[PDB]
Design a protein around this motif. Structure first.
Motif, short mmCIF file in Angstrom:
data_model
loop_
_atom_site.label_atom_id
_atom_site.label_comp_id
_atom_site.label_asym_id
_atom_site.label_seq_id
_atom_site.Cartn_x
_atom_site.Cartn_y
_atom_site.Cartn_z
N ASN A 25 8.58 -12.74 114.94
CA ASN A 25 8.17 -13.56 113.79
C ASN A 25 9.36 -13.79 112.88
O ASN A 25 9.48 -13.19 111.81
CB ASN A 25 6.96 -12.99 113.00
N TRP B 71 6.29 -8.93 121.68
CA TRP B 71 5.66 -8.58 120.41
C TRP B 71 5.81 -9.68 119.37
O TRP B 71 4.95 -9.83 118.50
CB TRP B 71 6.23 -7.27 119.87
N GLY B 72 6.89 -10.45 119.44
CA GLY B 72 6.97 -11.62 118.58
C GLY B 72 5.88 -12.61 118.94
O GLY B 72 5.05 -12.96 118.10
N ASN C 192 5.09 -5.82 111.05
CA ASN C 192 5.77 -7.11 110.91
C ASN C 192 6.65 -7.75 112.01
O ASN C 192 7.36 -8.71 111.70
CB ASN C 192 6.68 -6.98 109.70
N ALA C 193 6.48 -7.41 113.30
CA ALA C 193 7.17 -8.00 114.43
C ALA C 193 8.66 -7.70 114.45
O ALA C 193 9.39 -7.96 113.49
CB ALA C 193 6.94 -9.50 114.52
N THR D 49 9.80 -16.04 111.05
CA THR D 49 9.14 -16.36 109.80
C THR D 49 8.81 -15.08 109.05
O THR D 49 8.56 -14.03 109.64
CB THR D 49 7.86 -17.16 110.05
N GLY D 50 8.78 -15.18 107.74
CA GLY D 50 8.62 -13.97 106.96
C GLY D 50 9.96 -13.50 106.43
O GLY D 50 11.01 -13.64 107.08
N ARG E 299 -3.17 -6.89 118.01
CA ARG E 299 -4.13 -6.86 116.87
C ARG E 299 -5.55 -6.55 117.36
O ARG E 299 -5.93 -5.36 117.32
CB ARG E 299 -4.09 -8.19 116.11
C1 LIG Z 1 5.25 -12.12 110.71
O1 LIG Z 1 5.34 -12.06 109.29
C2 LIG Z 1 4.19 -12.51 108.57
C3 LIG Z 1 4.52 -12.39 107.11
O2 LIG Z 1 4.51 -11.04 106.69
C4 LIG Z 1 2.99 -11.66 108.97
O3 LIG Z 1 1.82 -12.13 108.31
C5 LIG Z 1 1.32 -11.05 107.50
O4 LIG Z 1 0.42 -10.20 108.22
C6 LIG Z 1 -0.08 -9.12 107.42
C7 LIG Z 1 -0.94 -8.27 108.32
O5 LIG Z 1 -2.08 -7.78 107.62
C8 LIG Z 1 -0.85 -9.66 106.22
O6 LIG Z 1 -1.27 -8.57 105.40
C9 LIG Z 1 0.03 -10.60 105.42
O7 LIG Z 1 -0.73 -11.21 104.38
C10 LIG Z 1 0.60 -11.68 106.33
N1 LIG Z 1 1.49 -12.56 105.58
C11 LIG Z 1 1.14 -13.78 105.19
C12 LIG Z 1 -0.25 -14.22 105.56
O8 LIG Z 1 1.90 -14.51 104.56
C13 LIG Z 1 2.79 -11.75 110.47
O9 LIG Z 1 1.71 -10.90 110.85
C14 LIG Z 1 4.05 -11.30 111.19
N2 LIG Z 1 3.89 -11.43 112.63
C15 LIG Z 1 3.15 -10.58 113.35
C16 LIG Z 1 3.07 -10.86 114.82
O10 LIG Z 1 2.56 -9.63 112.83
#
Ligand SMILES: *[C@@H]1O[C@H](CO)[C@@H](O[C@@H]2O[C@H](CO)[C@@H](O)[C@H](O)[C@H]2NC(C)=O)[C@H](O)[C@H]1NC(C)=O
Ligand SMILES: *[C@@H]1O[C@H](CO)[C@@H](O[C@@H]2O[C@H](CO)[C@@H](O)[C@H](O)[C@H]2NC(C)=O)[C@H](O)[C@H]1NC(C)=O
Ligand code: NAG
Ligand code: NAG
Ligand code: NAG
Lengths: 495, 132, 72, 107, 99, 72, 50, 49, 132, 107, 72
Positions: free
Chosen positions: A153, E51-52, A149-150, A155-156, B112
């Motif tokens: 990001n 990484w972000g 999960n970064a 976001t999230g 990725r």
């Molecule tokens: C930042 O956070 C978002 C939210 O979790 C990440 O998106 C997710 O990525 C995973 C990887 O498989 C998925 O399973 C989730 O469904 C995603 N969330 C969604 C689509 O809402 C995002 O990957 C993160 N940033 C990075 C660079 O990984």
């Protein structure tokens, strides 16, 4: 996490006070903090939203003319008049030309003459203000320690949004597990609104302090208007020709919009579309950490056999995040993370995951740490010792104190004596610092302010010169203070 | 849904230039990378190049060096491939598709990577023929 | 008009860059130096003044860089 | 550069049989490799990523293997609807490249 | 009479399209094809990635941008040679003749 | 920008009035004096400088009016 | 640094500052070369043309 | 193993097309449309007419 | 002899671009100016623009501002006119011809004059139609 | 800018007649003016330059006149093969422009 | 161009010989000496300068060898 990569960041070590910390944070920045316990948290600052504005001022950048009658009396007697001069929606001027038998009328002199014009405006400026109320900050306070999960990001969902308003306080926040946290803002100590104006142009906006926005030239008009069309000015707008002798003429001045850009430089802009977007600014919160769990405790130490995916990732002085993926049985057991010297355990790193942890198993858990200035030997492995990784951190101890001092200098600048507050609980010396610089720089504040790059640096060198003239040892109170404040504040500012 | 609609097949004269369009749906048009892959009938797959919807960064293979431009319209959520100096060898079917990756701008290998580049969410292809 | 009073020293300046950021200063300089190139004589006479008045050397330097600052 | 060799070029097999492909890389590609199925007149399709992995919605008879330069795709039991041409894909370094393909013929 | 036109100043323009790019590394200073046609405007700047941003290395990155550029309004400025240019004079007698 | 180059001293003039016609001068003055009213402290410090450097009374006067002129 | 075959290992800065036509790693048709001033010199004999 | 490519230096080139222009020897500084595309090389000089 | 051969008539879709060629013979291809003049059927003559074979200098009329490029190949002693953003109004016949030329670059008035503009040997014209 | 007016728009005439056209200029064009003949489906053709001058190879019945803004083209004796549309051309200043044209109809 | 800045002092070297391998030095000397032979007068005048300026004997020697180095 959510901090990493932004550079420009704020490590705050320790708390004490029985859990008392002082954090000063603003949007482009963020903050990472630690204690001898409790999980490392990061304070990242996002959009500030002031809800209810109220509209003070009407400035128009463009207009047009029409109708526009004019008149003149005579030789001598009288100063001409015209009825439409009575509706101030027109613009008026007196001038003087001449008349005579050519003009046809009376005895040969330099005559009075007048003119008026309809006046109607093109694009406006909506400038409003907001009272130190109806305005709020939104913060994400994010935990470290894995998942995937970064480091990034923003976001999230992790650190919630922890919204706050001066109307409320005490900023009660919760996160999973340990996540009980108490923050306290001091927004009234913020940007000092009522000095502030939010100014919407066609779709970019700018935040500028009030007075200047009052004194600014160009057509006036008060917040009430609607139909008023009452504009009060126009003398600096449409200019009137008077060629050599006869006639006279009126001229739409032409849009200044760009020139107004050239003016609003030296000001942070603001995007405003819906209700507010407000960015920048800064705020200072105080943090009480008491009820925080370490996020797990009495566990077993892993088992063994980590198999690791990534790099090194040295950013910005230290933190060196690593990503690893545990392989095995043992279920969320602690990860024996260590940072040591050559062999012969002297062991010194400093680890910021504090208490890293395995999750559900398979998931790329990650870590960050601070190796010394030199060679570093990092070891996550235990029973068959597993993984050692060689590392080298370059740089210099001395260099790090130096650059640190540069930071703290920029902090002395930009964000003033609130900066002195940015540490925590220095007892006496910190407080007396905040006060001394408070009134002290305050008197330097504003008084010799309103000055720019050039005049700043220049006045600097001259006054430090007159100081170098060496009278009565007062040169220092000249001189060192002088050159410092002047020069250092000279180049850093104006950004 | 995840979807791609390319424009219909076309034929051009040698030395010319052709413009093929790739429209997408079912996701955030700025959230995935675009690549163009060509297949000549008597051959397999060949990777032409790449464009990033977000921001406009691009890259291309050495074989097509100088010969191919890539653009986009974000408003329409659509990508445009264009080939110049058309020659009979160019006659083939073209394809466009996506990537999950990180962004700003378009390469990546460490982040990725992979994930059905053009096998599950690939367009329908389009035929182009260079002929006199 | 708005051509001048360009809201600069003022205050409130934030961590984030503002507007012309890192231009309008070097604009200001380049501008005025250009105008110096165009009207060298005025530089000459002014400098002469610097050698006339005061003139305890540092003084000369100062009042001269007034010449620079005279008027665009 | 990242020359990807695919073997064999074609196979014919009876229903229910186990079939395997092999792709060999001029450089170590680690775990980046892919396995396509494509039916004629159809866009290509997904089967295997990271050389090890099925996609959701893919039948279970499919598998993939291999690590450094060498890889094997496998269908446990040949099924008639599986007639297609199959591929392997090197993503590494991004001079993106494919295997030449392998055609099947049902017996 | 006869001028000849030297200069085009535009007082206003607009933008569109306007792609941009960054390499992310250290390595490289990013490039974009439309940077080729000078009808665009271009700039390099530097931000950061990691990484972000997702990609490499954690550093302050190079980045670029370009924009299409088109102007609606102008200035027509011309010059005239010290030739066909002319003066018109009225040389009027005194002495009566009313009006 | 064009905000400053305002084609003034230049030459060529003529017998007929030009443009802002007995304004832009008194404009120039009024605005700088306004800005003086707004930032009195800077006036104070500057004047002090005048009393510091040179100071040769006429000198003080000069460098003072300079430090008035110094605001962009 | 790979030339037609032979290659050379040289430290970065110098390899940045080196003259001759620039062009960034992206390429991709760009033909965008900076520089060229140090390349491709222009004659201007005595008066006419160039 | 894995490199990544930063720089393109060319040791040799060639020219073609190569239009040129002049206004006449005051008003104007000459212009040519292909000066647009930076793939060309451009120069101003001064001769006489 | 003094001669001009333009390429044959063509038809294009709106918004497109068309390229018409003008070949010449009977003189030194660098010794005369080239101009393009268009005639719409329900209208008379309209002056599109000018190119100089020697050196490449060019100019165009205000109406076609932005819309028309002119180039040449000296080796072939040939000129190329090209119009962009084709629209139905553009449908017309086009013509090219010459001028007796002082030297370097193109356009003169004072030096006497050409004493024509596509009337002597500008060519045979060519028809172009903008249609869907 | 420079507006070239052509009169009349059309004429019908019997063979052998004398015919004249007039072109009027919004600005003084001095001696720069031209006279075209163009037969339908044919490229335009030369007749008069500098408003005063025949071309070699042109029949002598043609003439042209006028100086500052005003001009007259003349055929002494109408001849049947002369059926065409005729033009006048301002070259001055180079926002190159033509007259609207004058059609003939034989009687 | 690449004609100069020939990546020499730099660093990094190694245990193994590099490129021109005990030549380019010898080259450098031989060429500049050659050019000295070709233009003796310049040597003369330069040396004279050495006898003029400083001259503090060791000084002369120094500035002389420099004025030999000075030819590009
Ligand atoms: C930042 O956070 C978002 C939210 O979790 C990440 O998106 C997710 O990525 C995973 C990887 O498989 C998925 O399973 C989730 O469904 C995603 N969330 C969604 C689509 O809402 C995002 O990957 C993160 N940033 C990075 C660079 O990984
Ligand atoms: C300026 O001159 C004009 C032209 O002569 C004068 O207008 C004339 O006035 C007389 C007076 O009866 C008439 O008879 C003429 O017919 C007029 N001329 C015209 C209409 O063209 C005019 O009066 C003079 N100015 C003044 C103030 O008398
Ligand atoms: C002024 O102009 C307006 C046009 O908007 C029209 O009403 C009329 O011409 C004038 N009206 C007056 C003089 O009241
Ligand atoms: C700009 O975008 C428009 C769509 O709004 C598109 O039609 C046009 O081709 C684009 N132009 C360029 C130069 O990218
Ligand atoms: C250069 O000229 C050749 C023929 O001489 C032509 O084919 C080519 O398109 C021209 N290139 C440019 C950029 O005009």
């Amino acid at each position: 996490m959510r901090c990493i990569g932004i550079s420009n960041r704020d490590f705050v070590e320790g708390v004490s006070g029985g859990s008392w910390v002082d954090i000063v944070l603003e949007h482009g920045s963020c903050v990472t903090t630690m204690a001898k316990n409790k999980p490392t948290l990061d304070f990242e600052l996002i959009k500030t939203e002031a809800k209810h504005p109220a509209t003070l001022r009407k400035y128009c950048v463009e207009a047009k003319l029409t109708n526009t009658t004019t008149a003149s009396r005579c030789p001598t007697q009288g100063e001409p008049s015209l009825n439409e001069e009575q509706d101030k929606r027109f613009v008026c001027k007196h001038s003087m030309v001449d008349r005579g038998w050519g003009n046809g009328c009376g005895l040969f002199g330099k005559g009075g003459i007048v003119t008026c014009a309809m006046f109607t405006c093109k694009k406006n400026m909506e400038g409003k203000v907001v009272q130190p109320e109806n305005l709020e900050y939104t913060i994400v306070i994010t935990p470290h320690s894995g998942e995937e999960n970064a480091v990034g990001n923003d976001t999230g969902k992790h650190g919630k949004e922890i919204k706050v308003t001066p109307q409320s306080s005490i900023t009660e926040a919760e996160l999973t597990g340990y996540g009980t946290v108490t923050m306290e803002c001091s927004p009234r100590t913020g940007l000092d609104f009522n000095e502030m104006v939010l100014l919407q142009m066609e779709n970019k906006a700018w935040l500028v302090h009030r007075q200047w926005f009052l004194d600014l030239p160009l057509p006036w008009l008060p917040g009430a208007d609607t139909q008023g069309s009452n504009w009060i000015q126009k003398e600096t707008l449409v200019t009137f020709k008077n060629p050599h002798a006869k006639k006279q003429d009126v001229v739409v001045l032409g849009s200044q919009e760009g020139a107004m850009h050239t003016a609003l430089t030296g000001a942070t802009e603001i995007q405003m579309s819906s209700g507010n977007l407000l960015f920048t600014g800064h705020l200072k919160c105080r943090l009480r950490m008491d009820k925080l769990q370490l996020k797990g405790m009495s566990y077993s130490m892993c088992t063994g056999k980590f198999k690791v995916v990534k790099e090194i990732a040295e950013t910005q002085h230290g933190t060196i995040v690593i990503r690893v993926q545990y392989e095995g049985d043992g279920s969320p057991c602690k990860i024996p993370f260590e940072i040591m010297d050559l062999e012969k355990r002297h062991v010194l790193g400093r680890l910021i995951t504090v208490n890293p942890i395995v999750t559900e198993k398979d998931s790329p858990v990650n870590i960050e740490a601070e190796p010394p200035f030199g060679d570093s030997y990092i070891i996550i492995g235990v029973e068959p010792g597993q993984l050692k990784l060689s590392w080298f951190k370059k740089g210099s101890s001395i260099g790090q104190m130096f650059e640190t001092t540069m930071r703290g200098a920029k902090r002395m600048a930009i964000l003033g004596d609130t900066a002195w507050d940015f540490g925590s609980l220095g007892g006496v010396f910190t407080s007396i610092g905040k006060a001394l610089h408070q009134v002290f720089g305050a008197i330097y504040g504003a008084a010799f302010s309103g000055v720019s790059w050039t005049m700043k640096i220049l006045i600097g060198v001259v006054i430090t010169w007159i100081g170098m003239n060496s009278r009565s040892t007062s040169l220092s109170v000249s001189l060192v203070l002088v050159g410092v404040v002047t020069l250092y504040l000279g180049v850093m500012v104006q950004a | 849904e995840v979807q791609l609609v390319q424009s219909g097949p076309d034929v051009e004269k040698p030395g010319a230039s052709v413009k093929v369009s790739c429209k997408a749906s079912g996701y955030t048009f700025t959230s995935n990378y675009i690549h163009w892959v060509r297949q000549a009938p008597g051959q397999g797959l060949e990777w032409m190049g790449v464009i990033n919807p977000r921001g406009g960064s691009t890259a291309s293979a050495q074989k097509f060096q100088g010969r191919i431009t890539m653009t986009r319209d974000t408003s329409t959520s659509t990508v445009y491939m264009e080939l110049s100096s058309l020659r009979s060898d160019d006659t083939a079917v073209y394809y466009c598709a996506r990537g999950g990756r990180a962004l700003f701008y378009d390469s990546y290998t460490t982040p990725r990577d992979g994930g059905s580049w053009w096998f599950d969410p690939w367009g329908q292809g389009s035929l182009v023929t260079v002929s006199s | 008009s708005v051509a001048l009073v360009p809201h600069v020293g003022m205050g409130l300046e934030t961590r984030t860059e503002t507007w012309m950021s890192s231009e309008g200063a070097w604009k200001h300089a380049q501008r005025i130096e250009t105008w110096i190139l165009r009207h060298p004589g005025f530089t000459i006479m002014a400098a002469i003044l610097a050698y006339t008045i005061g003139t305890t050397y540092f003084q000369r330097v100062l009042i001269f860089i007034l010449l620079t600052a005279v008027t665009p | 550069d990242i020359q990807l060799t695919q073997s064999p070029s074609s196979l014919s097999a009876s229903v229910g049989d186990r079939v395997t492909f092999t792709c060999q890389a001029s450089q170590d590609i680690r775990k980046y490799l892919n396995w396509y199925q494509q039916k004629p007149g159809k866009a290509p399709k997904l089967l295997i990523y990271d050389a090890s992995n099925l996609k959701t919605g893919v039948p279970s008879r499919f598998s993939g293997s291999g690590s450094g330069t060498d890889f094997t795709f496998t269908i446990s039991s040949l099924q008639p609807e599986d007639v297609a041409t199959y591929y392997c894909q090197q993503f590494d370094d991004l001079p993106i490249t494919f295997g030449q393909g392998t055609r099947l013929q049902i017996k």
